[PDB]
């Protein structure tokens, strides 16, 4: 167990002790244990702290702010993650300077202490969000082994959606999260139900779950209705995920998805399921989602009336879990050669076992697909295509003094058609990879793999100018419209965003903020709203779209596009330094950019930053 999760029984025990002590403190309890600093968060058992009253969504969900959590999103697709609003408000309320939580975190950071976030019930959920906050504020800025956090939760509700889990996987952060769940514990299942389904019964169940509230008399009816509603919505979510994961029946699934309201919350991080005799660790979020349903069923038909009460009592059974940790059999489900025994001890039916096996096989498929992609991008014929473009086509076009953009665009020689052939083959391969990414058929880590980011960036920088030339060569700017608006292949947008995320995420800023800060840094004097209006769908956001902007700027009067001109000029040097734009090309005598640049008014050219890089018109 310890060589997989990276935490031992000592840390689990201390985390449980701190979680218990947190019941008696304001907001949080700090426990200093030599080299370890444990932050335990006070749990809450009011419905307000599970479904925010002012939240108007069916599951109390809210999108994260892309500024404060730039990594919690899909990179290529852009979609930001969604979390439970009540838990986010509770974390926000504890990060509040008056609580000394942040000051203590920074004191432990400067002291290179091992920081541990923990909590029971919803407090553990806060710990999960605090860990993400920590990962965004501290760990991503300087990833040391001393700075690595640990998140340990006990019976925590679900917090994020599928994008949340995917982003955690891509950043290699999932390994830090361990969520202990007693087999029947209802609390991890609560947020899988529609809020209208439990609006009447939630306060009573929360009152029964509070360990310090032995006042409200237990009611059989309310608990049974609650259990039935939660299991019904959970079954609907799990069956839809089952039908969607295997890619079959996509038409009827898409139509019902338009007409079905299913909880978005998904397991994030490692889950450890516990019984009297077994500890079963599971990593695959889909498998955990299925197990949250199929492990909480009755064996006989006589126990169906009993399960809801055991599902309540099991939330207060974590003391026994922690005390009997070393006496239980452990196994790693994902690494097992046979999973029948483990799931049989967890009461998982045959069908639930087949769904778990299918989820694991789907993850193995994604891994195989990634192995195939690595083999492809490491083959000689593939790297040779890029080498040929870089070392033969570009120098020959530079020797003709017009550049390889203009040479491709006019395509007067056989070499231009050969470059077009290799451009089409590369386009097909990267579109096929993009297709796999869109269907979630690659591992979560794929977009974070530095070898892939390197290759895709080299590809984008080399060949996107050629796809822009192909676009304008066939007059698609007049038929379809501006390249930046309706023409840009999605594969290049994915490559750009993957590269930007890779290089920007250690500094906590997002690409848009950097861009607009440079725009205001160019001292144009115009109103920021007006400039954002002018630079809407501008080609100046990506160096490999340099030529697209030239196409959009040539032909227009100078006054009409003066701002976009000075913007394009202000981005050029970093683009050249970073290798996004080749300095041996764009300044050639026969280059479209140079030919258009000379026709600009002499008043601009005189005080233009590019005057010293091209001879004047004499």
């Amino acid at each position, epitope marked *: 167990f310890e060589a997989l999760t990276g935490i031992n029984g000592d840390l689990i025990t201390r985390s449980w002790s701190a979680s218990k002590q947190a019941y008696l403190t304001e907001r949080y309890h700090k426990e200093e244990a030599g080299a370890v600093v444990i932050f335990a968060f006070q749990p809450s058992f009011s419905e307000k702290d599970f479904f925010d009253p*002012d939240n108007k969504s069916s599951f109390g969900e809210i999108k994260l*702010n892309r500024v404060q959590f730039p990594c919690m999103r899909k990179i290529g697709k852009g979609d930001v993650a969604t979390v439970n609003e009540a838990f986010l408000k509770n974390l*926000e309320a504890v990060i509040d*300077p008056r609580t000394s939580f942040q000051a203590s975190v920074e004191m432990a950071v400067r002291s290179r202490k091992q920081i541990v976030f923990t909590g029971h019930s919803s407090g553990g959920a806060t710990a999960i969000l605090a860990t993400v906050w920590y990962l965004e504020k501290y760990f991503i800025r300087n990833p040391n082994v001393y700075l690595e956090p640990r998140c340990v939760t006990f019976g925590a509700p679900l917090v994020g959606d599928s994008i949340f889990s995917h982003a955690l996987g891509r950043e290699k952060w999932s390994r830090f999260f361990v969520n202990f769940v007693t087999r029947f514990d209802i609390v991890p299942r609560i947020t899988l139900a529609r809020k209208a389904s439990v609006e009447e019964t939630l306060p009573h169940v929360l009152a029964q779950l509070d360990p310090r509230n032995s006042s409200v008399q237990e009611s059989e009816q309310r608990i049974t209705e609650f259990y039935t509603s939660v299991m019904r919505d959970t079954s609907t979510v799990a069956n839809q995920a089952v039908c969607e994961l295997t890619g079959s029946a996509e038409a009827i699934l898409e139509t019902l998805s338009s007409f079905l309201e299913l909880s978005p919350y998904r397991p994030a991080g490692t889950f450890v399921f516990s019984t009297e005799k077994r500890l079963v660790a599971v990593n695959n979020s889909d498998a955990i989602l299925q197990m949250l349903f199929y492990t909480c069923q009755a064996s006989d038909e006589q126990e169906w009336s009993l399960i809801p009460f055991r599902s309540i009592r099991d939330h207060h059974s974590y003391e026994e879990l922690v005390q009997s940790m070393g006496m239980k059999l452990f196994n790693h489900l994902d690494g097992e050669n046979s999973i029948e025994s483990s799931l049989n001890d967890l009461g998982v039916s045959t069908r639930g076992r087949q769904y778990v096996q299918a989820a694991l096989e789907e993850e193995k498929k994604r891994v195989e697909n990634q192995k195939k992609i690595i083999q492809v991008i490491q083959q000689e014929r593939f790297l040779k295509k890029l080498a040929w473009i870089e070392d033969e086509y570009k120098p020959k076009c530079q020797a003709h003094k017009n550049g390889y953009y203009d040479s491709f665009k006019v395509s007067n020689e056989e070499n231009d058609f050969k470059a077009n052939v290799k451009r089409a083959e590369l386009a097909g391969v990267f579109d096929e990879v993009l297709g796999l990414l869109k269907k979630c058929q690659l591992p979560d880590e794929f977009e974070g793999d530095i070898d892939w980011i390197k290759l895709a960036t080299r590809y984008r920088r080399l060949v996107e100018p050629l796809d822009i030339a192909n676009y304008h060569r066939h007059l698609k700017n007049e038929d379809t419209g501006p390249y930046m608006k309706r023409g840009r292949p999605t594969r290049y947008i994915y490559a750009q965003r993957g590269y930007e995320h890779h290089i920007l995420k250690p500094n906590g800023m997002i690409a848009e903020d950097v861009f607009w800060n440079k725009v205001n840094g160019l001292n144009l004097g115009l109103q920021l709203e007006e400039i954002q209006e002018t630079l809407k769908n501008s080609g100046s956001e990506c160096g490999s779209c340099f030529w697209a902007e030239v196409e959009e700027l040539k032909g227009k009067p100078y006054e009409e596009v003066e701002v976009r001109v000075k913007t394009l000029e202000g981005m050029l040097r970093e683009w050249i330094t970073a290798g996004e734009v080749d300095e041996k090309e764009i300044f050639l005598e026969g280059s479209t950019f140079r030919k258009w640049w000379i026709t600009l008014p002499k008043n601009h050219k005189s005080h233009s930053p590019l005057r010293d890089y091209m001879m004047d018109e004499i």
Partner: nanobody
Amino acid sequence: QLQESGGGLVQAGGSLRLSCAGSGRTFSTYDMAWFRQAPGKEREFVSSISSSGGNVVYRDSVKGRFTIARDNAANAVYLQMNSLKPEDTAVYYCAAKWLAADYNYWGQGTQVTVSS
């Protein structure tokens, strides 16, 4: 724990100052914003302060007439409303919220009536 104040009744061209104060450490870690709810009309966005950053963008009907300001010492928000329009009669609310896409810490709001 967000509360507004400063709503009154004045005709066109009036100068008003709406104040918005909270009980938690809000100021520059929650990016402020002002919305207005007109009777029947949507809660149309008025403006927003980008918390610590001085970035701020009003929308059309206001630019150069309603200023927005923050106060970290008093953790308050100040909406100056000069050259009022009879079409500005609405319930003004201040919303401050971060870690999220859309804001969701709303107050009680205050009525602002402009006649002719």
